[PDB]
Each structure stands twice: as structure tokens, then as C-alpha cells.
């Protein structure tokens, strides 16, 4: 059945999951109560949208999702919200006390109380799957739950599910968008703890989406809702191949094999085009070749960095909507002629492509205008190391003076785990330099 189980951890992951499953329902015609009139396969079926939704005998399409947060405020809104009966009570897990921006509390202290319960609920969803393909894990780097509990969950999932695919969607912190002083520590600790358990991680620099929303959509002062709705477009493009039937779509295994050249180098740079308001979309259409070119403009990346100063190692271009192969092949042909777009010399063939003819969908309320052709590019570029460097520097400034470290030691951690995690990051930075060097 090729099912995929989504796991949303912490405020960011939960709230990002709210925008994704809202979009999914709009793309599949699922009502807030879960009823799907267009589905005649009542109680089950082998349809492509069943990879993300399970069916009940009463015609209820239930997300294959688990929501976990160490405090109940955020998920409580889901329990009383407009999609309250879309999910099952067992799928919405909450504690009483949060991790307090502390990785250690999310991983060791408050996390342990709830981790065994979370695995059991994930287990319950797995047993309903005939051919579970992998896990999607949405979380922030900055929060204590998103960093500490996610790390705990990823380690436990590797034991209970072995090498089964685990993909992340990670929110890289930024001062613009409600960050905290200790978030660099949490980002480094969770990255190091998760490096060896994640097969492909999709970072989203919250500063980048803040800028895109503030520039492309003319939103003076973006909100989390504005950002999440934009993130959901990228998540939808990546999972469209799995939720819809099609002859030219990219499943997860196909997706990971063509984008990750080495196990540790698994942080693709996401872009989406077109991101445009209704006022600009009025009397204006963009073509396949136009949105393909926009994917290589650093101004549209989901993570702030300069691909022009780095090297590409693999590009995945997921087209959707009114897109024809002939235009796709011509647009990609142009990119290969551009000497401004340099591939490593060990990547002679570096484009994975796909098309999902289902048209892009807009939330009724979401600042994005409804377009007819959209493309999401995911490129493994060395430039992404710039994001690691920025975060590593902030880690060094605080850690040199051991600022805030006592909050982590008080919860049972040792300073050795800080330096070990930092050394792993140093190796990763050197790894990105090594893969970018020309061959002999």
C-alpha cells in the first residue's frame, strides 16, 4: 500500500501539520468531518490518497498522523478546532509540562514520561498499514520538544523499525521569527543526535520564509499561519507523488536515491515557484521555463544561502499542474547550458524530474494566489553548509563562556555531549567542503 505515517512534534511541527493536513483535505476533497463524497471505496481501497489517509466503515478518512507535544495548549486547539473530528483522540498526544526550550528536558526528563506512549500509538498506526514506506517527522530545531523529544523519537524509531525511511521537515531558527537565546544549542544537539537516524532532512530557514512572505506576498509582518501555509506547499509538492496516481511521479525511495549522494549529506535545499499574490497574478501567467528559472535564483530558497557560490550534487524538480513533458525537457535543457549553475564533476546526470497533473491548491484564506503550474525544486548543494556555519558560530559564542549550559547539566547532560555534538557539526562542515572539491 506504500503508506506514510506523519509525526508532528512540538508547537511548530503541530502547527505545520495543521496547515499540511488542511491542504491535503482540500486537494483530495475531504470534508472537515472526514467524509469524502468522491470516494466510492468505502472502508478501504488501494487508492493513492490512502497512503496518507485511512478509511473507516463509516466513510471517515482519517490521517495517518500522530501529534505529540509536551504541553497541551497547541494541540488543544486542534481538539476544539475546525478539524477536531478529522483525527482520533488517540492520535493527539499531549503532556502537562513542556520542555521549556531545553533539549535535555525534551530528550531525557519530560520526554521519557511520554515516549513509550507515543511509540505505542505509532505502533497502532503501523499495524493498520500493509506496506509502510516510512515516516515523515515535522519539528523545530529551537524548541525543547521539537529538538529533544524528536531526537528521542528518531532513535527509538530506528530500534523499532530499523532502516525504514525517516524524513524530516525542520524549522531552522531565526531572530526575526520568535526565536530564543538557547535555540542554537538545541539545533546543534538535535542535528548531531539525528544525523545518523535520518535519511533526508528538509530544513526551512524561518528567516527565508519570513522574507518571501514579506516580499513576494506583500505581507508587512508575517504570521506563523502565513509561514506554515507556504511550507505546506513544499510539503504537498513532495508528497503529491504519493497521494495521487500518475505515470511520471517520484515516490519516496525514488526520491531519496536520486538526491542523497552520501548518507550524511542529506539536507536538500527546497525552493517553490511561483510564490505570488492575487494582485500580481491578475492578468499575468508564468510559464514552465519561467518557474524553472526561479528555482535557481537564491532569492527564493527555503534556506538562506548562495547556491551560486556552491556546487550542485543533485536536483529534483517536482512539477505539478498544467505542465507538459516537452516544456519540462526544454526548460531543464536550458539550465544545463547555464555555466552559472555548476554541478560537481562526479554528477554527470543530476536531474530527477516528475509531474503531477493535479493542479496546485490554495487554502481559502491563504495569501497564495491559485496558479495552474507550480514547481518545487529540491537540490543538494554545498551552499547549504552556509546555514550550518551560521548556526555553528552562534553555538561557539555562547559555549565558549558556557552560557546557559547549566540549564542542560541540571537535567542530566554532560558538557561532553555539547563538544561531541559540536565536533560532529565540524565534521559535517568539512564533509561539505570535501564533496565540493574537484576530482583528480
Amino acid at each position: 500500500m506504500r503508506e506514510c505515517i506523519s509525526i508532528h512534534v512540538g508547537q511548530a511541527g503541530v502547527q505545520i501539520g495543521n496547515a499540511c493536513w488542511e491542504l491535503y483535505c482540500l486537494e483530495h476533497g475531504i470534508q472537515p468531518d472526514g467524509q469524502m463524497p468522491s470516494d466510492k471505496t468505502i472502508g478501504g481501497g488501494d487508492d493513492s490518497f490512502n497512503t496518507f489517509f485511512s478509511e473507516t466503515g463509516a466513510g471517515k478518512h482519517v490521517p495517518r498522523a500522530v501529534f505529540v507535544d509536551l504541553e497541551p495548549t497547541v494541540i488543544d486547539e486542534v481538539r476544539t478546532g475546525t478539524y477536531r473530528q478529522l483525527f482520533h483522540p488517540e492520535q493527539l498526544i499531549t503532556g502537562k509540562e513542556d520542555a521549556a526550550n531545553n533539549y535535555a528536558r525534551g530528550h531525557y526528563t519530560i520526554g521519557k514520561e511520554i515516549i513509550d506512549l507515543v511509540l505505542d500509538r505509532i505502533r497502532k498506526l503501523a499495524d493498520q498499514c500493509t506496506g509502510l514506506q516510512g515516516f515523515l517527522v515535522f519539528h523545530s530545531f529551537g524548541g525543547g520538544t521539537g529538538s529533544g523529544f524528536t531526537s528521542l523519537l528518531m532513535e527509538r524509531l530506528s530500534v523499532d523499525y530499523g532502516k525504514k525511511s525517516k524524513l524530516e521537515f525542520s524549522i531552522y531558527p531565526a531572530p526575526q521569527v520568535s526565536t530564543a537565546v538557547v535555540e542554537p544549542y538545541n539545533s546543534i544537539l538535535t542535528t548531531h543526535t539525528t544525523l545518523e537516524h535520518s535519511d533526508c532532512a528538509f530544513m526551512v530557514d524561518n528567516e527565508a520564509i519570513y522574507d518571501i512572505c514579506r516580499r513576494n506576498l506583500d505581507i508587512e509582518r508575517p504570521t506563523y499561519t502565513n509561514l506554515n501555509r507556504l511550507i505546506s506547499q513544499i510539503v504537498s509538492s513532495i508528497t503529491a507523488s504519493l497521494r495521487f496516481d500518475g505515470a511520471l511521479n517520484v515516490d519516496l525511495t525514488e526520491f531519496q536515491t536520486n538526491l542523497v549522494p552520501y548518507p550524511r549529506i542529506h539536507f536538500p535545499l527546497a525552493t517553490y515557484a511561483p510564490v505570488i499574490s492575487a494582485e500580481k497574478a491578475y492578468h499575468e501567467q508564468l510559464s514552465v521555463a519561467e518557474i524553472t528559472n526561479a528555482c535557481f535564483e537564491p532569492a527564493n530558497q527555503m534556506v538562506k544561502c548562495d547556491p551560486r557560490h556552491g556546487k550542485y550534487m543533485a536536483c529534483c524538480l517536482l512539477y505539478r499542474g498544467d505542465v507538459v513533458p516537452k516544456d519540462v525537457n526544454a526548460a531543464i535543457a536550458t539550465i544545463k547550458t547555464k555555466r552559472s549553475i555548476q554541478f560537481v564533476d562526479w554528477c554527470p546526470t543530476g536531474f530527477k524530474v516528475g509531474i503531477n497533473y493535479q493542479p496546485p491548491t490554495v487554502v481559502p484564506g491563504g495569501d497564495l494566489a491559485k496558479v495552474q503550474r507550480a514547481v518545487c525544486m529540491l537540490s543538494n548543494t554545498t551552499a547549504i553548509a552556509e546555514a550550518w556555519a551560521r548556526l555553528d558560530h552562534k553555538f561557539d559564542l555562547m559555549y565558549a563562556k558556557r552560557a546557559f549550559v547549566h540549564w542542560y547539566v541540571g537535567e542530566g547532560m554532560e558538557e561532553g555531549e555539547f563538544s561531541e555534538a559540536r565536533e560532529d557539526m565540524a565534521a559535517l562542515e568539512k564533509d561539505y567542503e570535501e564533496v565540493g572539491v574537484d576530482s583528480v
Binding site: T109, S158, V159, E414
Partner: protein
């Protein structure tokens, strides 16, 4: 060739098998060392409450011995 085709799958199984145990064991000690560390950080607070209470009683004794007029 058949013999090789089968060494491959048996090795692939071993890959996944050892992945689970390097994860089960690493997570095992991280929770062990974290238990000890917070136990020590709480056993040290059982010694500060002990000394703080002991010093309070020494004070109340000194008052007592000073009332002897």
C-alpha cells in the same frame, strides 16, 4: 551467481540488524549516564538540605546555651 545473490541479501539483513543494535545500545547508555547524572545532582541536594538543617539546629542550640544566666 546464485551463491552470490544470496550473500547479498544476507548481508543486507546484517546491515539492518546492526543498525538496530548500535541504536539500541547507544540510546541505552545515554539514558543510563543521564540517570546517574541527575541522581548525583539530586543526591548532592540531599546533602545541602542536610547541612542547611544541621546548621539551623546548631544556631538554635547556641541560643539555648546563651540563655544560661
Amino acid at each position: 551467481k546464485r551463491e552470490h545473490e544470496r550473500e547479498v541479501i544476507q548481508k543486507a539483513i546484517e546491515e539492518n540488524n546492526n543498525f538496530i543494535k548500535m541504536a539500541k545500545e547507544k540510546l541505552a547508555q545515554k539514558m543510563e549516564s543521564n540517570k546517574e547524572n541527575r541522581e548525583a545532582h539530586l543526591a548532592a541536594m540531599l546533602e545541602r538540605l542536610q547541612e542547611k538543617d544541621k546548621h539551623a539546629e546548631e544556631v538554635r542550640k547556641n541560643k539555648e546555651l546563651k540563655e544560661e544566666a
